[PDB]
Design an enzyme around this catalytic site. Sequence first.
Site: not given
Ligand SMILES: Cc1ccc(Nc2cncnc2)c(C(=O)Nc2ccn(C(C)C)n2)n1
Ligand SMILES: [Mg+2]
Ligand SMILES: [Zn+2]
Length: 313
Positions: A68, A72, A106-107, A217, A269
């Site tokens: 963050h 980003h 935003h962050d 985002d 993922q």
């Molecule tokens: C908010 C957010 C933005 C990006 C994200 N991943 C990302 C970013 N850039 C590259 N590869 C991947 C993620 C993320 O993996 N969150 C996750 C992991 C598991 N969970 C549960 C199932 C809810 N949520 N979350």
């Molecule tokens: Mg945010």
């Molecule tokens: Zn963000």
Amino acid sequence: GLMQFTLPVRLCKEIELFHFDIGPFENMWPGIFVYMVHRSCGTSCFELEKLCRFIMSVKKNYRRVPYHNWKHAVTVAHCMYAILQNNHTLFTDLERKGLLIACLCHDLDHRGFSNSYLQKFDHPLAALYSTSTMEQHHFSQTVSILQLEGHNIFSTLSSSEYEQVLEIIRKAIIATDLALYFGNRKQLEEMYQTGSLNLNNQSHRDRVIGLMMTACDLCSVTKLWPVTKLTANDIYAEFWAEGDEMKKLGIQPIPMMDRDKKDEVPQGQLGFYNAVAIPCYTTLTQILPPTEPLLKACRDNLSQWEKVIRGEE
Ligand SMILES: Cc1ccc(Nc2cncnc2)c(C(=O)Nc2ccn(C(C)C)n2)n1
Ligand SMILES: [Mg+2]
Ligand SMILES: [Zn+2]
């Protein structure tokens, strides 16, 4: 007035595509952002001296966290740029102006922790803002920077226009709270299937802009696999540190944030792309069809994660 921004040929071509990566050179990002604002909103919309000063103060208020961060911020702003360029007839001048700024800010001041961590810790920000804690703080930080001497980039706007652009920025930053996305996307899905969606209704425009904010985002999942794979380590570095802090509060963290469950990442993922990313880009392509390359690239990375589980990488 006649000092246009230019990018090297590869960057100049690549910047138009949704999967563009801004590279490792921090010094180029303010220029990339300014080039995007000029092509998106015009050479005239902002006074270059005030814009550069605003950008540098925004940069100064981003922290050195793995995900963050300032990188980003510019990535999210580029994704908004790509959407605005492929749907240029749909948005007002004020919206184009406001959304790029909203993405950059935003962050602001993110320390790498979720709203739940702030709540469990009993952080003062949780007392000040019951819901969307970080997001209200991010907007509060944006307003602070705009009130600095020589930083008001919307100085030429009328009092009512300024109030409007600030209200677009507020709603857009609040929309980046993922807890709010689920409801918003469900409501937008129904409006589209029941043909009741009208972009002339202001409350419908707000909902669509909210979806674009979530889409921008999460755009790290719509890059080419080497970029997405590497950015995933960055977000997990934050998740694991937050889980470490959860354990210090005497709380067992969710498997996602537990660094002792590193092996469960590819499965996590898959759950993320299935529950969050694919539904987001699917609904966004229905409402804004030129945004299809995002869903295309997102589906590709979901397939790549499936290969990882199946021992093919
Ligand atoms: C908010 C957010 C933005 C990006 C994200 N991943 C990302 C970013 N850039 C590259 N590869 C991947 C993620 C993320 O993996 N969150 C996750 C992991 C598991 N969970 C549960 C199932 C809810 N949520 N979350
Ligand atoms: Mg945010
Ligand atoms: Zn963000």
